[PDB]
Specification:
Protein name (chain D): Spike protein S1
Strand content of chain A: under 5%
PDB class: viral protein
Structural class of chain A: little secondary structure
Oligomer: part of a larger assembly
Entry title: Three RBD-down state of SARS-CoV-2 D614G spike in complex with the SP1-77 neutralizing antibody Fab fragment
Bound molecules: a molecule of 2 linked components (NAG-NAG), 2-acetamido-2-deoxy-beta-D-glucopyranose
Organism (chain D): Severe acute respiratory syndrome coronavirus 2 (2019-nCoV)
Helix content of chain A: 10-25%
Keywords: viral protein
Largest sheet of chain A: none
Chain lengths: 49, 49, 97, 142
C-alpha cells in the first residue's frame, strides 16, 4: 500500500481490502515519513488495542 | 396489584443467564438502581389491620 | 340489618373476584414508579452528543485528552437524567404523603 | 468463567463475571446488548461459544450506630446481599470500602434487607429502635 511503485490517480482512486491479518499501527504512526496522519473516530495511539 | 421488586434480596443466581435477558429489574440493578424493602412487612400490616 | 350487611360483604368478594381494574389507584402508583425507573435506565442509551453512549468505547478508542471531552458530555446528560428523576420522585412523594 | 475479571474481547474492554450462555447468536453477531445499550453477552473470538456478561457483585453499605458518645461499636448492613458475598469479598484483593474486620463474621445475620454483621440476632421482640427493613430493627443493649 504505502511503498508500491505506482499509485492510482485521484479521479480513479484505488481501494484495497485489508482482512484476516495482524495490523501494526505503531509501525506506521511512529514513522517520521508522514506529513499528515489524521484520525476521525479513534486516536492513532489506540489503534493497536 | 402486581409489584415490581419487593426489595427481598437478589443473589446473582436468580438474575444471571436467562433472567439477564428477560427481566427489567436486572437491567435496573446492573446500572446502580435498587429497591429497598419497607420497614413493616405485609404480614405486620395485616396484624395491625 | 345483619342479612343486608352479610350480603353487601358478599358483593365486595364477588366484585374483587370479577372486575380487573378496581385497584387502579394502587396499580397507577406501581406503574408510575416502574415507568420512571425504565425511563432512567433508557437514558443510558443516549449519546448526549458524544461519539458513543458506551463509556468503555470512548476509553477504548480515544486517548486521555480526547476522551475527557466525550465523557463530559455523558456526565452532563446522565447527571441531568438523575436530577430529573429525583425531582419527579420528590413531586410524587408529596402526592403519596 | 464464574470469576470477576477485566475482560477485553476484540477491543471491547469491561469489568465483569463471565458465564456460559444459552443465547442463540446468528453468525453475523459478535455481541448482545442490554436496554441501556451496554454489552451483556459476547461470542469468544477463539472458541465460538457465547458468554453472558454480568457485573461483579455490588450493593449499598449502611452503618448502624448508637451515638458516638454512647459507643464506638457499629454494625454493618450490606444491603440486598446474601451473606456468602461478604466472606467471598476477602481482602487479599481490592474493594470500594477498604475495611474488612467485620468479614471475620461469627455474628452474621441474614435479613431480607441484606447481610447484617456486628449485631447479635435475639429471638425476643422489642419496639423499633433503629430500623433495618423487612420487620428487623437494631438496638444497643446489655
Ligand atoms: C443464600 O444463598 C444460599 C446458597 O449459597 C441459599 O441456600 C440454598 O437454599 C435453597 C432453599 O432452601 C436450597 O434448595 C439450596 O440447596 C441451598 N444451597 C446451599 C448450598 O445450601 C440460601 O437459601 C440463600 N438465603 C437467602 C435468604 O437468600
Ligand atoms: C482459534 O483456534 C481454534 C482452535 O484451533 C479454531 O477453531 C478457531 O477457528 C481459531 N480462530 C480463528 C479466527 O480461526
Ligand atoms: C454525650 O456523652 C458525654 C459523656 O461521654 C456527655 O458529657 C455529654 O453531655 C453527652 N451528650 C449528649 C447530648 O448525650
Ligand atoms: C430462637 O428460638 C428457637 C426455638 O424456638 C431456637 O431453635 C433458635 O436457635 C433461637 N435462635 C437464637 C438466635 O437464639
Amino acid at each position: 500500500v504505502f511503498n508500491a511503485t505506482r499509485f492510482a490517480s485521484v479521479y480513479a482512486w484505488n481501494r484495497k481490502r485489508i482482512s484476516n491479518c495482524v495490523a501494526d499501527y505503531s509501525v506506521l504512526y511512529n514513522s517520521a515519513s508522514f506529513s499528515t496522519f489524521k484520525c476521525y473516530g479513534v486516536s492513532p495511539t489506540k489503534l493497536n488495542d | 396489584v402486581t409489584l415490581a421488586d419487593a426489595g427481598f434480596i437478589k443473589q446473582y443466581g436468580d438474575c444471571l443467564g436467562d433472567i439477564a435477558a428477560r427481566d427489567l429489574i436486572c437491567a435496573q440493578k446492573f446500572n446502580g438502581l435498587t429497591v429497598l424493602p419497607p420497614l413493616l412487612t405485609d404480614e405486620m400490616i395485616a396484624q395491625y389491620t | 340489618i345483619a342479612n343486608q350487611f352479610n350480603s353487601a360483604i358478599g358483593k365486595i368478594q364477588d366484585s374483587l373476584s370479577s372486575t380487573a381494574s378496581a385497584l387502579g389507584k394502587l396499580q397507577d402508583v406501581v406503574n408510575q414508579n416502574a415507568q420512571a425507573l425504565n425511563t432512567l435506565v433508557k437514558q443510558l442509551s443516549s449519546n448526549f452528543g458524544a461519539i458513543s453512549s458506551v463509556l468503555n468505547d470512548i476509553l477504548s478508542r480515544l486517548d486521555k485528552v480526547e476522551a475527557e471531552v466525550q465523557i463530559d458530555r455523558l456526565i452532563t446528560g446522565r447527571l441531568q437524567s438523575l436530577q430529573t428523576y429525583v425531582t419527579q420522585q420528590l413531586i410524587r412523594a408529596a402526592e403519596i404523603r | 468463567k464464574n470469576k470477576c475479571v477485566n475482560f477485553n474481547f476484540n477491543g471491547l474492554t469491561g469489568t465483569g463475571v463471565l458465564t456460559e450462555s444459552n443465547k442463540k447468536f446468528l453468525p453475523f453477531q459478535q455481541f448482545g446488548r442490554d436496554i441501556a445499550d451496554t454489552t451483556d453477552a459476547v461470542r469468544d473470538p477463539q472458541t465460538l461459544e457465547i458468554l453472558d456478561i454480568t457485573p461483579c457483585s455490588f450493593g449499598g453499605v449502611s452503618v448502624i450506630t448508637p451515638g458516638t458518645n454512647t459507643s464506638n461499636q457499629v454494625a454493618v448492613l450490606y444491603q440486598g446481599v446474601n451473606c456468602t458475598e461478604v466472606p467471598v469479598a476477602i481482602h487479599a484483593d481490592q474493594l470500594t470500602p477498604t475495611w474488612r474486620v467485620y468479614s471475620t463474621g461469627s455474628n452474621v445475620f441474614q435479613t431480607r434487607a441484606g447481610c447484617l454483621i456486628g449485631a447479635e440476632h435475639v429471638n425476643n421482640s422489642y419496639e423499633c429502635d433503629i430500623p433495618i427493613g423487612a420487620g428487623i430493627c437494631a438496638s444497643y443493649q446489655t
